Design a binder for this molecule. Structure first.
Ligand code: HEC
Ligand code: HEC
Lengths: 161, 159
C-alpha cells in the first residue's frame, strides 16, 4: 500500500500542503515580469513537485495515479547577474498552486484534476478553481494528461522505456 | 541517517545515482543568448542536497561533514509558453558536485572537494584544483562556499 500525501476537508478541498519541499522535484521554469509587460500571469520562478508516492507509480507506469498531488511553488526573480553570468536567479517565495487527480473525489472534472489556488501560505485550505480558470489552458496545451511534461525533464527521463 | 554518495579507495566521488530523489534547494538559469552565445554553465541549473545533510541543515543551519550537493545542468528548450515569455527547460546537459569532508579534504577551502563529470556515462568524477572552482565559490558564496543567496529552500528551512 502507498501513503496518501494530501489531506482533504469534508467537501474534498485540499488542505494547504505541508512538507512539499521534501517531495520530488520535477522541473523549474521562469516567466519574469520584465518579459511580460511588467506583470507576468504567474510571477516569476516556478518550482514544481510531485508527491513521492505518485513518483514511484510514475516510475513504473508513466501515468499519474489516482491520488497524484503536484505543487507549483512561485518565487520572485532575485537578480539578473551573478558570478556565473547573466540570467535569472531566484529571490523570495511568493506562493503556491496545486492540482490533484482523483476519480473518486472529482468525477465530473476534466481529467479528474482539481486545481487549487491558495490565498497565502497561512491559509488553512486551498480554493478549488473553475474549469475555465485553470483546466482549459492545461488541456489545450499540456503534453500529457493535462500536466506540462514538456517542461519536466525529471518526469520524461524517469518514465519507463 | 547515513552518508550519501559513494567513493573509490582514493575517495573520489563515484557518479551519484538517485540525486533526483534528494532535496531540491533552488533553480537558476544562465541562457547562452545572454552570454555571447556561450554561457559558462549552460543553461538551467537545478540543485540538490542529500537527505541526511538536509536533515542536519534544518536543525543547525550548517553543512555537516558528508554533505553532497549536485548541480544538474539542462538546456533552454523554449522562451515562450502559454504561461508567457521567459525560459523553459529542455534536455539534460550534465552535472557538477561538491562534497564537504573535514577528514578527507583537510587542505581544501572549507574542506569541500569539487567534482566535474565528463558525461552521464562517466563512472566517477574528476576532482578539481582550487583555482578551477573553489576560488569563485569562496569569493562570492553567501555561506560556507555555497550560493545560498540563490537557494530559498535552504534559507527558509534553517532555524
Ligand atoms: C504550471 C502549473 C502547474 C504545475 C504542473 C503543470 O501542469 O505544469 C500547476 C499545478 C498549475 N500550473 Fe497552470 N501552468 C501553465 C503552464 C504553461 C505551466 C508550466 C510552465 C510554467 O511553469 O510556466 C503551468 C499554464 C496555465 C494557463 C495558460 C494560460 C492557465 C490559465 C493556468 N496555467 C492556470 C492555472 C491555475 C488556476 C488558478 C492553477 C491552480 C494552475 N494553473 C496550476
Ligand atoms: C553553482 C554550483 C553548485 C551548486 C551549489 C552552489 O554553491 O551554488 C555546484 C555544486 C557547483 N557550482 Fe559553481 N557556481 C557558481 C555560481 C554563481 C552558482 C550558483 C548560481 C548558478 O546556478 O548559476 C554555482 C559560480 C562558479 C564560478 C564563478 C566564475 C566558477 C569558476 C565555478 N562556479 C566553478 C565550479 C566548478 C569547477 C568545474 C564546479 C564543480 C562547480 N562550480 C560546482
Amino acid at each position: 500500500k502507498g501513503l496518501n500525501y494530501g489531506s482533504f476537508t469534508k467537501e474534498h478541498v485540499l488542505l494547504t500542503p505541508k512538507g512539499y519541499r521534501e517531495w520530488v522535484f520535477i522541473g523549474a521554469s521562469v516567466t519574469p515580469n520584465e518579459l511580460n509587460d511588467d506583470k507576468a500571469a504567474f510571477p516569476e520562478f516556478h518550482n514544481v513537485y510531485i508527491d513521492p508516492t505518485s513518483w514511484g507509480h510514475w516510475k513504473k507506469t508513466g501515468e499519474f495515479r489516482d491520488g497524484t498531488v503536484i505543487v507549483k511553488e512561485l518565487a520572485g526573480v532575485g537578480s539578473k547577474a551573478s558570478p556565473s553570468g547573466n540570467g535569472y536567479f531566484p529571490g523570495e517565495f511568493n506562493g503556491i498552486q496545486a492540482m490533484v487527480k482523483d476519480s473518486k473525489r472529482y468525477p465530473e472534472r476534466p481529467g479528474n484534476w482539481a486545481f487549487f489556488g491558495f490565498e497565502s501560505y497561512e491559509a488553512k485550505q486551498g480554493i478549488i478553481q473553475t474549469d475555465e480558470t485553470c483546466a482549459a489552458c492545461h488541456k489545450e496545451h499540456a503534453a500529457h494528461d493535462m500536466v506540462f511534461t514538456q517542461f519536466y525533464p525529471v518526469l520524461r527521463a524517469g518514465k519507463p522505456s
